[PDB]
From a paper:
Anion exchanger 3 (AE3) is pivotal in regulating intracellular pH across excitable tissues, yet its structural intricacies and functional dynamics remain underexplored compared to other anion exchangers. This study unveils the structural insights into human AE3, including the cryo-electron microscopy structures for AE3 transmembrane domains (TMD) and a chimera combining AE3 N-terminal domain (NTD) with AE2 TMD (hAE3NTD2TMD). Our analyzes reveal a substrate binding site, an NTD-TMD interlock mechanism, and a preference for an outward-facing conformation. Unlike AE2, which has more robust acid-loading capabilities, AE3’s structure, including a less stable inward-facing conformation due to missing key NTD-TMD interactions, contributes to its moderated pH-modulating activity and increased sensitivity to the inhibitor DIDS.
Numbering used by the authors:
A (entry chain A), B (entry chain B): 673 to 859, 884 to 1210
Write the structure that this text describes.
Amino acid sequence: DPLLRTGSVFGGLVRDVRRRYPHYPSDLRDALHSQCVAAVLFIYFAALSPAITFGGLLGEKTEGLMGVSELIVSTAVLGVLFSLLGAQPLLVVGFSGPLLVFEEAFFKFCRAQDLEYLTGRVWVGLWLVVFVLALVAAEGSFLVRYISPFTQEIFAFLISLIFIYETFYKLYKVFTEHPLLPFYPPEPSPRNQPNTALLSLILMLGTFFIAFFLRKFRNSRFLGGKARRIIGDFGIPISILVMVLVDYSITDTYTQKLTVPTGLSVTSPDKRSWFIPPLGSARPFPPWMMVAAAVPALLVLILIFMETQITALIVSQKARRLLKGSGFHLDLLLIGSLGGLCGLFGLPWLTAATVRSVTHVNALTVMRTAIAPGDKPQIQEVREQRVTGVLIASLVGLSIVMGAVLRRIPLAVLFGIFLYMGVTSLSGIQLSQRLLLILMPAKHHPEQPYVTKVKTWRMHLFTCIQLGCIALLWVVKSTAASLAFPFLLLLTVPLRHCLLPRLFQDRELQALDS
Amino acid sequence: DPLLRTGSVFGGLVRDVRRRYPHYPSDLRDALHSQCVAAVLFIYFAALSPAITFGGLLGEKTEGLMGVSELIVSTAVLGVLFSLLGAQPLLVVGFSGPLLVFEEAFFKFCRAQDLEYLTGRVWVGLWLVVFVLALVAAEGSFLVRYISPFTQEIFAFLISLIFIYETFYKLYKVFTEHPLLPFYPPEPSPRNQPNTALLSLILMLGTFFIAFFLRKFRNSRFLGGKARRIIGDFGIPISILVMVLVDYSITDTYTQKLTVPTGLSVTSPDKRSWFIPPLGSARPFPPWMMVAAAVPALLVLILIFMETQITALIVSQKARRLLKGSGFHLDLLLIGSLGGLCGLFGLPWLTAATVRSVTHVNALTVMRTAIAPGDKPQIQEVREQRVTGVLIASLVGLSIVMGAVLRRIPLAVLFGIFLYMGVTSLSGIQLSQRLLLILMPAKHHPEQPYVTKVKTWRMHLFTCIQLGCIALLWVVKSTAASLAFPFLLLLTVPLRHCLLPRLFQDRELQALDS
Ligand SMILES: O=S(=O)(O)c1cc(NCS)ccc1CCc1ccc(NCS)cc1S(=O)(=O)O
Ligand SMILES: O=S(=O)(O)c1cc(NCS)ccc1CCc1ccc(NCS)cc1S(=O)(=O)O
């Protein structure tokens, strides 16, 4: 019962520490195997590229005040610290879209009001630290028990769908950069090149298909058990290596490759330095902003809380075989304090990543080798340790001095890897199965509790409600009011706890929503 | 059994006619369904393109004396006649590689000895007719009982492997004429075009994958049974239509398309006419060639007999549920007489096609709708009728006046269709399963009679012997002694009936070889 209120200050944090910290030698010892290496290799590529993309976008939006190096430094430091001190070291911290939206809006507000951007960020971080400490002190992390699988399913489905849509847009943009033309006259990124877009499509599809086939090969009967396990562990590294070699063999055509800033330096050394004075560099900071910086701190707190808590709820589900423990009080305090302290150095705030953490947990899941003939395998154990997160964060940080190797890796292989990750992420959601059940006839439905105890027409209405909520949420972030997305997401708890029982019966709700 | 000798002249032919001909109204009536349309649409494309390819090759080899229109006319006429009068109307007649080799060798011999080519072909055809009549009269078609599944599996495996290899050398060739170049300066088939090879590869892979996925969709649970059956029947037409539409949407890039001669005319109207005088056109024909034309007739008879009889053996296997009957005496007489009469008009000889007939039978197989969960589907029936062959031959003949539609179909879609056909053809051979069994561990082998009653190491030796025979046969036709391939193939019957019992036991041979 980690969500029970004790009535004493710092009680939940004390319970979390006392529950988790004794297992530390086990955490250090569990990581000696070959699956951890494959997980590290996969998740390092899964985590490095979003840093580059969001650093480029941030540099575009904030006129070069924050760039790629800032995001890389923040990711490395925060990930290392959280993995070393967290109670759930299987979470992956990084930048996300809502944080980018908030940063852009805050930059617009600061520019409109003739204020300094980084000093305002500093005071926002300080107020966020104060608010997070106050919230943790009052055991405010017990509201998580009010978050039903309704909201969790909606959030996960929307996040994975958005992830998938963005990979396809970045391929489309390749083809508009390099259209297929009848004539290519002979001649600052290259433009209007032949054989580029089709080769990128081929590389993406090949990487995806090799990864899928090697994943399917695990449950076959060919070769020995040890060889099957080893080959299935390293399916994604094998796909990446094979497609990189295929791309390297062809030396006539231009393909876009990974680029990283070289050296540890700020993006714009003339405009700013590493340390941001809290009282102002060129102008005094007015005290009224010093006082009024609480509201953006409140918005950041709401964003970080909702994201981290929903991710922690999804990761620690009972069907996923999580044993060593869970952290609902320590992780929030760690993330909030580190984010608030990051403001003094002009570094962006971070949160828990949903797709990356889910993929990290999936990569470490061990299935039973005694697979029943013609039966779906079941989870044997999940390996819990602290080495993988530290190694991933260290590699992300050290990627700055490893640009020579990274310049040989095309982006289409990473596009295929992202497609594989997004497709795999959608298979662990009950909404996916209840959406597949719509196409099949009613006489072929499995023996799930929401099939036998609920009428067929009364079960499809729940799925329709969830789909409508997801569509409304996507429509709202598409527009310019995307800053109100978290409030709209938290609004689904009153909907389930006040309006849903008025339509459905308690028995139906107990089986459908569990 | 139809393989028993009666002791009277024309006894086997009389028995075959009396067994098969009463079912004629059933043969005409069985064709009223939707699967026949899909089979016709698939096999028409399966049959038309080899005529074009072999017509081009024949025109190259014979200096334009025989071309594409001659092959089309021969295919149409012989197919229509055989389907109307045959006892096994599920066979598909057409040109093959061995026939091309014989024609090239005969042309070389005629050129070296200063003789006319078509008159020699006329006399070869007449001697072939005489030999076929003599062989059929003496009940010589009872030697087919000495052809064990050893030879049948060897032949089928080799033929399918060659088919697949040739589909990948015509894409390699497609890439070779259109290499990927850094620069494409603007400047008789087009050459050195951009975006052609990669687009052809994409079209091939897309057609193959759509066909495979739609074939897999048959055994799923989505949608109703009727919709599943209808969609699975038309998987290959749907793949072809979708990929043709995709290619048509892109109008910037050059792709090679189907071309057919227009009008009904001889390839070289100046050199020859439709009728070949048997006494000589420009020079008298020496009687010594008139007498000595028996040996090439013997070679042609051996080739046609072996190919047609092996194909008929493979098609009429007991596991394939053939009911209306089989023809071992009527089909040989029909094919031999029609081929011999074809010589007078300067048309090439035809034989039964293995891959095309196997695909034709597979396309008309009906599987039981009561599919057991987690179990292989069972064959319910095979639709035996005469309409499909007549329609396919008529369409092949009429394709001359339908070039406008045919010019919009790229060849890469057909390459993908050929790959699908070749892959599907290899799944009905026991050698395929016994070759898959090598990779799997000995504790996972099924309960087939060649597993339980034979030691594991003693069964792998039979597969090695078969593979060595196949490799030797392929090596022999690669070289210039490919005219002796049929003799080498028939040499495998003494090997099985004289040498194999000296090594294996009676029980081992009975279990391993049917
Ligand atoms: O976070 S994602 O990995 O899906 C992502 C990937 C790319 N490119 C390939 S790494 C580009 C953008 C995104 C995230 C886009 C996004 C997601 C959620 C929200 N919520 C807004 S309240 C907003 C965005 S936004 O950046 O398009 O505004
Ligand atoms: O008969 S096939 O459909 O495999 C074929 C197809 C193509 N091109 C695409 S339709 C080209 C050639 C062939 C057949 C080649 C062949 C097959 C068997 C033999 N054995 C007789 S000794 C010989 C040949 S050959 O034409 O290469 O000599």
